Amino acid sequence: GSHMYPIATNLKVSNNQLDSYLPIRNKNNNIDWQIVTGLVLSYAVKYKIDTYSLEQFREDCKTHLQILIDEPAFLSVLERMYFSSQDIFRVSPLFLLFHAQFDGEKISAGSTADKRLGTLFANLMRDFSLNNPLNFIEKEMLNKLNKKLIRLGEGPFAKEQPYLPYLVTCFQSDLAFLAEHPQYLLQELTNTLRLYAFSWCAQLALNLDNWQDGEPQSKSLFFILDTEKASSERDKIKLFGYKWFARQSEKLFPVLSALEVLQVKGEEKRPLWQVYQDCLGYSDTSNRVLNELNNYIQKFISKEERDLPERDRATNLEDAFKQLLSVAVEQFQGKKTERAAVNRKYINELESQICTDFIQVRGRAGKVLVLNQDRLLLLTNLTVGKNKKLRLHELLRGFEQRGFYLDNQSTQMLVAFYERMGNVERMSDSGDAVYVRKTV
Numbered sequence: 001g002s003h004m005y006p007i008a009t010n011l012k013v014s015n016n017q018l019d020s021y022l023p024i025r026n027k028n029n030n031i032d033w034q035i036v037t038g039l040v041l042s043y044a045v046k047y048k049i050d051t052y053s054l055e056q057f058r059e060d061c062k063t064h065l066q067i068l069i070d071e072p073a074f075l076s077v078l079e080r081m082y083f084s085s086q087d088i089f090r091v092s093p094l095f096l097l098f099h100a101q102f103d104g105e106k107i108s109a110g111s112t113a114d115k116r117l118g119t120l121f122a123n124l125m126r127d128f129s130l131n132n133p134l135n136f137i138e139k140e141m142l143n144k145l146n147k148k149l150i151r152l153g154e155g156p157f158a159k160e161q162p163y164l165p166y167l168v169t170c171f172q173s174d175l176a177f178l179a180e181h182p183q184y185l186l187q188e189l190t191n192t193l194r195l196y197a198f199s200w201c202a203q204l205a206l207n208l209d210n211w212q213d214g215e216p217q218s219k220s221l222f223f224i225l226d227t228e229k230a231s232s233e234r235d236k237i238k239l240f241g242y243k244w245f246a247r248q249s250e251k252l253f254p255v256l257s258a259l260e261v262l263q264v265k266g267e268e269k270r271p272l273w274q275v276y277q278d279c280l281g282y283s284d285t286s287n288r289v290l291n292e293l294n295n296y297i298q299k300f301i302s303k304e305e306r307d308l309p310e311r312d313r314a315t316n317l318e319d320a321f322k323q324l325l326s327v328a329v330e331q332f333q334g335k336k337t338e339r340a341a342v343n344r345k346y347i348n349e350l351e352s353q354i355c356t357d358f359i360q361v362r363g364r365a366g367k368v369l370v371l372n373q374d375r376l377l378l379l380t381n382l383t384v385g386k387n388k389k390l391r392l393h394e395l396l397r398g399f400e401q402r403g404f405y406l407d408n409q410s411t412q413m414l415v416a417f418y419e420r421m422g423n424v425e426r427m428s429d430s431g432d433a434v435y436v437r438k439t440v
């Protein structure tokens with residue numbers, strides 16, 4: 001197939017590190033979600049604002065308008081019309097750019113976690129653009145704003161080939177839908193990002209082991225509505241819920257840091273399933289790749305290095321990768337070790353900063369994955385989207401595409417929730433299907 005050598009030309013047995021894909025590290029995960037939101041919009045429209053506050057824009061806008069008019073009554077009214085900043089934001093979500101202040105090419109106030117999340121979403125937005133999301137006063141305000149907007153250029157984020165292409169499609173549809181509804185964009189863009197950040201990390205964890213199968217698809221992760229007791233014995237929740245997520249989450253840092261070893265310098269990063277595929281299609285008569293991996297693995301498990309059980313070299317590429325991923329995990333076994341502590345911090349950070357209110361306690365049943373009512377409404381609106389109406393099964397398939405699965409019982413409770421919310425065709429007529437519409 002190819003003749004591009006598929007992995008790093010020099011494979012160092014080094015300290016575990018990742019520079020890609022996961023948006024959290026073992027510490028320093030203080031996230032400014034409004035900055036992240038500003039960064040996302042900036043990358044969507046290819047503009048930024050440089051060291052210039054919304055406070056100052058507001059003042060400059062008043063001033064700008066009284067240069068054009070200067071009627072004492074008029075000033076007093078615009079003062080009142082735009083005293084509340086929500087009324088500036090409502091004119092255009094371009095105003096969210098003020099949250100992501102740049103200083104030259106640098107993100108002025110972001111933590112490095114903000115930049116990491118910015119990077120996740122920029123790689124869900126490859127080859128994606130928003131057309132800028134109006135009465136006569138508002139148009140003058142956007143005219144003043146356009147004078148402040150600086151072109152983004154390539155921007156500050158790293159390029160990473162999409163690990164989960166199915167979330168890309170969904171994310172881009174959802175951003176496009178929000179852009180058509182600017183008032184709803186303001187209410188929900190940020191929550192949409194928290195939702196995607198979680199689902200992306202969960203779906204990643206659940207697809208790590210599927211590196212043999214090429215391009216991944218949505219994996220069954222089951223959530224209850226936060227309103228449910230979860231007292232009866234539900235198989236899907238037990239087998240494919242929190243405990244499945246938690247088991248697979250334990251491999252994020254191990255597997256992704258190993259993948260980091262293979263990544264070719266001076267090239268866009270790519271996911272493990274792409275790297276494997278590239279290794280299979282590379283025609284090397286001399287088995288260069290297989291030999292390099294075996295050398296690395298054998299050096300990895302050596303006593304001077306990680307000190308792991310001896311094993312015969314891999315005779316093929318499939319078995320070489322499995323070996324790489326075993327040892328990648330094996331080094332974190334034994335609760336006592338220092339590396340097992342690092343992996344634990346990864347889990348706690350993930351659960352604290354990314355999984356907020358996706359997890360709850362349910363008595364003796366321990367932790368449980370939940371969808372709270374806000375997220376449920378957000379999903380409903382995103383999924384119905386540009387449609388007037390979806391059949392219930394159509395809706396659930398949308399939810400599933402985005403990483404959210406529901407058993408039959410949760411689906412009953414969902415429909416009941418929609419009756420109260422008044423966005424379902426259910427008991428009030430006799431129809432061919434259950435139809436769900438947007439609440440917005």
Ligand code: NA
Pocket residue numbers: 425426427428429430431
């Ligand atoms: Na009915």
